[PDB]
Structure formats: C-alpha cells, structure tokens
Amino acid sequence: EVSTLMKATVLMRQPGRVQEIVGALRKGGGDRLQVISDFDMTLSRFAYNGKRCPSSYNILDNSKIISEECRKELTALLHHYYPIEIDPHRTVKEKLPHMVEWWTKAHNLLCQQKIQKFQIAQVVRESNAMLREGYKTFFNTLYHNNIPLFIFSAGIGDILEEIIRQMKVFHPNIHIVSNYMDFNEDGFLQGFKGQLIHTYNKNSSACLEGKTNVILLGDSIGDLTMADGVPGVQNILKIGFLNDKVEERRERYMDSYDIVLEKDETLDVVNGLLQHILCQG
Ligand SMILES: Nc1nc2c(c(=O)[nH]1)[n+](Cc1ccc(F)c(F)c1)cn2[C@@H]1O[C@H](COP(=O)(O)O)[C@@H](O)[C@H]1O
Ligand SMILES: [Mg+2]
C-alpha cells in the first residue's frame, strides 16, 4: 500500500501492475536503485502563477550573450526544423537526419559567438528557471541515500548544471548526460564535448554496481526510451508528467507510462515512492 499514489494528480491505467513494480523496487531497496530523469518540464516546472516557465533552450535563446543576428538565425532554424519534428506523418527515421542537422547547425552557430564559460552562470542567474516543488526533498534524499541520478537533456549541460548549482542542490550523486560546451584554455567556446545528444538518442548509451532497478521520470512520449542502453534492467517504473494538451494526450500517456502525473508541479509522488522504497531494505 502506497499512500502517495492516491494524490489527485495520479493516473494509472494498471494500478495492480504498478503495485507489483513498486513492490519489486521495494525489495531491491536503495542498493539496486538508480533514477533516470529528463530535465526540462520534468525536474523543472511547466508553469508558475499562470505563467509558462522557460526551457533550458529558452534560457539560452533569450539571453544577453546571444546577439540579435545569432538569435535570428536560431529562430529561422526553429521555424524550419520544428515543423519536421512534430510532423504527424513522418516516422522517427524520417525525422532523424533533420534533427541531427538542426542540432549540428545550432551548435555550430553557438561556436561562432564569443561565448565564455563564466557567462553561463550569469545567464542562469538572470533567468526565470524554476524547479518543481519538493526538489529539496528529491535531491537531498537521493544524495543522502547514495542513489545515482542521471539527468538527460539534449540541450546545453552547462545550463542545467548552473540551474541545479544555483538552487544549492548539485550533490555529487547527480550526473548530467547532455551536450557540454568545450572551452579552450582562454575560456572561449570552441565546440561541444562528447557525442552529440539530440532528441532521438537521449538515452543511457550516451553515458554501475548492480543498479538493476530504475525509476524513469519524463514529460514526453520520447522520454520513455531514456533507460534504453542500461544493461540487465530487472525492474523499471516509468512516471510521466502530463503538463499540456491534457485531453488530447491523456489516453496516450496513460497507455505508455506506468504512472501519469497530470498538471502536477510537484515531486510529491516521486518523493513518496522514493521514501517507500528506501525505507524497506
Ligand atoms: N525552444 C527551442 N527548443 C529547441 C531548440 C531551439 O532552438 N529552441 N532546439 C534546437 C537547438 C539544439 C541545440 C542547441 F544547442 C540549441 F541552442 C538549439 C531544439 N529544441 C527542442 O529540444 C527538444 C529535445 O530536447 P529535450 O529532450 O532535452 O527537451 C526538442 O523537442 C526540440 O523542440
Ligand atoms: Mg522534458
């Protein structure tokens, strides 16, 4: 019996199956647990006080480090490629090369600007970034219980890192899997480290001591693949935030996610399950 799953925001297509998965995670305990979470609109809020909260892309796109001309080119890239991303009549494989182009073109553009490492903190300090209510309990509980948290984003990892750092919850159990800026010795942006992470490879292959049990947190249908690449996953619980277009997407989300949290700007349910799992061996 999990009290937290009775919150008004909770939707479960198969509650009996959910209680089976939760009971399996309970028996594994913290020793076998890892959390794999998207960032934008999952750990960060969708809206606050009737106003939409920015994505990590918005924080960069509206920032003062980006010039007028560069912002115009980034906008033209979006008007070109975003309709491809959301085209209902194309398969993933018919969107994949264009998303790779979109990301490569945007990164190449950022590298033509004179971005310096210290400017990222300034961009975040002035932004309206907000984490979901209960983030202190979420990050603090994972850290004190030695639970690895992998945060996935196809955006800029330095931006995510500075948001969490400035909220005083960047504990060493946090591992951000994203596109990190590559700075030269002078501190100027010259490229991006590692392999490109775009919207279709935001999964664990971009990244363990018996971490067979997974809690997955996301807000998009694409986020369901984030744990793909984790070897020997014995149990997985997928929790999805349904923030927008609720009537159109509710049945889809309930079919795909084990637990759906509808218009819930808190981590209350995730924190309750975490406490339930960790407290029972
Ligand atoms: N607002 C905004 N959104 C973008 C942009 C953008 O320019 N502006 N771009 C292009 C871009 C790529 C790399 C950059 F460094 C950059 F500055 C711009 C991608 N997206 C979104 O990224 C989500 C997947 O990533 P996530 O899984 O992490 O949410 C997808 O739904 C995309 O619509
Ligand atoms: Mg997201």
Return all residues near 103 (Cβ < 8 A) that are at least 6 apart. 154, 179, 196, 198, 199
One domain for residues 38 and 169: yes
Q: How many angstroms separate the alpha carbon of residue 96 from the centre of ligand 1?
A: 14
Q: Provide the residue type at 249 as one letter.
A: R
Tokens of residue 50, six digits = 């009737």
Residue 48 lies in a domain: no
Helix residue ranges, H only, the chain: 15-28, 56-61, 68-85, 96-111, 119-126, 135-144, 157-166, 246-256, 268-278
Any known ligand binding at 202?
yes
CB 120 within 8 Å of CB 158: yes
User: Is 67 among the domain residues?
Assistant: yes
Residues 24 and 75 in one domain: no
Strands 189-192 and 47-48: unpaired
- Are 31 and 268 in contact by the 8 Å Cβ rule? The answer is no
CB atoms within 10 A of CB 36: 28
Q: Is 264 a catalytic residue?
A: no
The reply, when asked if residue 40 is annotated as ligand binding, is yes
Can you say whether the dihedral through the CA atoms of 89, 226, 201, 183 is positive or negative?
positive
Neighbouring residues of 150: CB distance < 8 A, sequence distance ≥ 6:
34, 35, 36, 37, 175, 176, 177, 204, 207
Whole-angstrom distance, CA of residue 281 vs CA of residue 30? 7
* Whether 96 and 216 share a structural domain: no
CA distance 270 to 239: 8
- Give Cα 204 distance to the centre of its chain: 12
> 190 lies in a domain?
no
Q: Which residues pair with 181 in a beta bridge?
A: 192
Q: Which of 97, 128, 159 is the last residue of a domain?
A: 128
Three-class DSSP category at 130: coil
CA nearest neighbour of 146 among 175, 167, 168, 166: 175
Q: How far apart are CA 136 and CA 139, in angstroms?
A: 6
DSSP assignment of 10-22: EE-S-HHHHHHHH
Say if CB 95 and CB 60 are below 8 A apart.
Answer: no
Q: Whose CA is nearest to atom 2 of ligand 1?
A: 57
Q: Are residues 70 and 8 in the same domain?
A: no
**How far is it, in rounded angstroms, from Cα 34 to Cα 246?**
29
End-to-end CA distance of the chain: 16
- Closest of 56, 35, 36 to residue 44, by C-alpha: 56
Residues with CB under 5 A from ligand 2 (ion): 38, 40-42, 219
Domain boundary residue, one of 128, 158, 173: 128
Closest-lying ligand 1 atom to the alpha carbon of residue 41: 29
Q: How far apart are CA 163 and CA 127, in angstroms?
A: 9
**CB 145 within 8 Å of CB 278:** yes
Give the resolution value in Å: 1.6
Q: Would residue 221 be called left, alpha or beta, if left means φ above 0 and alpha means ψ between -120 and 50 degrees?
A: alpha
In this structure, are residues 124 and 64 in contact, taking their beta carbons and an 8 Å threshold?
Answer: no
C-alpha 181/C-alpha 155 separation (Å) is 10
Among candidate residues 163, 176, 175, 171, the one with its CA nearest the CA of residue 143:
171
User: Is residue 85 a known part of a binding site?
Assistant: yes
- Please tell me the distance from the alpha carbon of residue 112 to that of residue 149, in angstroms, as a whole number: 33
* Experimental determination technique: X-ray
Please give the tally of structural domains in the chain.
Answer: 2
> What number of CA atoms fall less than 13 Å from residue 34's CA on the CB side?
21
| d(C-alpha 174, C-alpha 138), whole Å | 12
Q: Would residue 240 count as lying in a domain? A: yes
Whole-angstrom Cα distance, residue 245 to residue 196?
30
Task: Confirm whether 223 is a catalytic residue.
Answer: no
Domain that includes residue 94, residue range: 55-128
Q: Which ligand is nearest to the CA of 61?
A: 1
* Residue 196 lies inside a defined structural domain of this protein: no
At CB < 8 A and 24+ separation, what contacts does 183-191 make?
183/116, 183/117, 187/116, 187/117, 187/118, 188/114, 188/115, 188/116, 189/110, 189/111, 189/113, 189/114, 189/115, 189/116, 189/117, 190/111, 191/107, 191/111
Strands 149-156, 33-38: pairing kind:
parallel
Percent helix / strand / coil, the chain, rounded to 5: 40, 20, 40
9 part of a folded domain: yes
232: left (phi over 0), alpha (psi -120 to 50) or beta: left
